[PDB]
Write a protein that binds this ligand. Structure first.
Ligand SMILES: O=N[O-]
Ligand SMILES: [Zn+2]
Length: 168
């Protein structure tokens, strides 16, 4: 309960209101909706390490208070209150037998998702590759003007937050 450590199934169908609130194009919202990932969560002290298995891709992230978040700011993380926040977005989580339950809050957004424990079915690697490439285009085209979204940032319990660099 107090330790959320485990393996969870995170399907894109469970986060569609969040993707819409991120001002993502219809193609990205729909592509993420067809994808599903396994996220292995390890909570140590005031840190959360995440390994996301998505098609033929592995992504690793670590959630710590003050972690830099790429844009085009910093992550606020309080493990004692099970809260994460950055920019307009905030989230709260709790683990149970039904899995990892997360509430995502922002102006115009109040969405809850529950991610069941276990291992996810494997999304097709062609769909994952097309999704990652389309997210990359959106990020670059949106510089000619939000977070720099990572694929594991959208297909994850703590979306839209993805610390770390664009590389592993
Ligand atoms: O809806 N996938 O382009
Ligand atoms: Zn990443």
């Amino acid at each position: 309960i107090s330790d959320i450590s485990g393996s969870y199934v995170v399907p894109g169908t469970a986060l569609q209101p969040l993707y819409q609130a991120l001002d993502l194009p219809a193609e990205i919202v729909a592509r993420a909706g067809r994808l599903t990932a396994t996220v292995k969560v390890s909570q140590v002290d005031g840190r959360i390490d995440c390994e996301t298995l998505l098609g033929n891709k592995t992504f690793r992230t670590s959630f710590v208070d003050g972690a830099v978040l790429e844009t085009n700011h910093n992550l606020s993380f309080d493990a004692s209150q099970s809260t994460m926040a950055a920019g307009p977005f905030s989230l709260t989580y709790a683990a149970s037998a039904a899995g990892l339950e997360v509430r995502y809050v922002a102006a115009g957004l109040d969405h809850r998702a529950v991610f069941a424990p276990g291992v996810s079915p494997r999304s097709a690697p062609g769909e994952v590759t097309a999704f990652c490439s389309a997210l990359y285009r959106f990020n670059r085209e949106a510089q000619r003007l939000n977070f720099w979204f990572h694929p594991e940032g959208l297909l994850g319990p703590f979306a839209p937050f993805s610390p770390g660099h664009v590389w592993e």
